[PDB]
Amino acid sequence: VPSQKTYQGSYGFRLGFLHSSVTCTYSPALNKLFCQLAKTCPVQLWVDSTPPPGTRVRAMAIYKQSQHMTEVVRRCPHHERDGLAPPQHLIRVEGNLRAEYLDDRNTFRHSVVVPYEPPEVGSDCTTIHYNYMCYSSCMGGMNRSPILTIITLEDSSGNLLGRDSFEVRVCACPGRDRRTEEENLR
């Protein structure tokens, strides 16, 4: 099972989030992103030093709870029904002409990878636009089992260079749900 532990590594890799009728909102308190289905989720990649050419960025979802971490996160039957992302994949990347949709031969886990690109002129960070294609309610079962998105910075061979992660709740009312959860967190 993929590790969720933060690993800034040698390039000082870490994620940043943007608040984007709320379609996508991030709670620092809960280290949790709340977003609507199939809407743009801007995730920022920050590094202290530019990684080597050929560096890649992979996004993968896993269940948070240890008791279900061996289960593969995938879309529900209803939702697995752009000609690029396989219908079974929860996470899609929007606006990248080099996204690769992968299925691990041994674990059957899904992931989407794009080349790492240095911040463009006029920016201090690199931003990736993710879309979540199924609701937490579809994937969580009775006791709403939460999922985590794990983002890894990798070299051309797949070797780990850095990792960061966040809980994600894909839901109809991101704004309301965040308030409810932060409320309960108090």
Instruction: Determine if residue 19 is labeled as part of a ligand binding site.
Output: no
Least Å distance between CB 148 and Zn ion?
A: 18
Looking at the chain, the number of H-run helices and the number of E-run strands are: 2, 11
Interacting residues with Zn ion between 6 and 25 (CB under 5 A): none
37 binds Zn ion (CB under 5 A): no
Task: Tell me which stretch binds Zn ion (CB under 5 A): 20-28, 73-81, 114-122, 168-176.
Answer: 73-81
Of 37, 38, 76, 102, the one binding Zn ion (CB under 5 A) is 76
Q: In whole angstroms, give the CA distance from residue 186 to residue 184.
A: 5
**Within 10 Å of residue 122's Cβ, how many Cβ atoms?**
5
Residues in the interface with Zn ion (CB under 5 A) total: 4
Nearest to Zn ion of 70, 137 (CB atom)? 137
Q: In whole angstroms, give the CA distance from residue 26 to residue 41.
A: 10
| Nearest CA-CA partner of 137 in 177, 87, 179 | 177
CB-based burial, 14-26: b 16+ in 10 Å, e otherwise: bbebeebebbbbb
133 binds Zn ion (CB under 5 A): no
134 binds Zn ion (CB under 5 A): yes
79 binds Zn ion (CB under 5 A): yes
Instruction: Determine if residue 129 is labeled as part of a ligand binding site.
Output: no
Q: In whole angstroms, give the CA distance from residue 176 to residue 146.
A: 17
138 binds Zn ion (CB under 5 A): yes
Interface positions with Zn ion (CB under 5 A):
76, 79, 134, 138
Q: Which residues are annotated as a binding site for Zn(2+)?
A: 76, 79, 134, 138
